[PDB]
Amino acid sequence: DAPEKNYERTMAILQIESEKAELRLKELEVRRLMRAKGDGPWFQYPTIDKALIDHSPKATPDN
């Protein structure tokens, strides 16, 4: 191969792998923040659906 080809191919490889490494570091930080605060789409452990509540007038008024 030409030294141009190996050189520019190495630059392409280093850009792709540096991008993947920075994205993995961001992935770790995002997972840490979403487990800590619970405000993102991940770690959304389920609660009770409020569509199950009967909002009809019951038999006794104090409720």
Partner 1 sequence: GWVRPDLGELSKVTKVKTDRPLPENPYHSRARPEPNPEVEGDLKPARHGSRLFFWTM
Instruction: List contacts with partner 1 (CB under 8 A).
Output: 16, 19-20, 23-24, 27, 39-41, 44
Min dist. Cβ of residue 5 to partner 1 (A):
20
Min dist. Cβ of residue 53 to partner 1 (A):
12
Query: What angle is formed at CA 43 by the lines to CA 37 and CA 44, rounded to 5 degrees?
Result: 95
Toward partner 1, which CB reaches closer, 27 or 29? Answer: 27
Q: What is the 3-state secondary structure (H, E, C) of 29-45?
A: HHHHHHHHHCCCCCCCC
**Residue 51 near residue 58 (C-beta atoms within 8 A):** no
Toward partner 1, which CB reaches closer, 3 or 55? Answer: 55
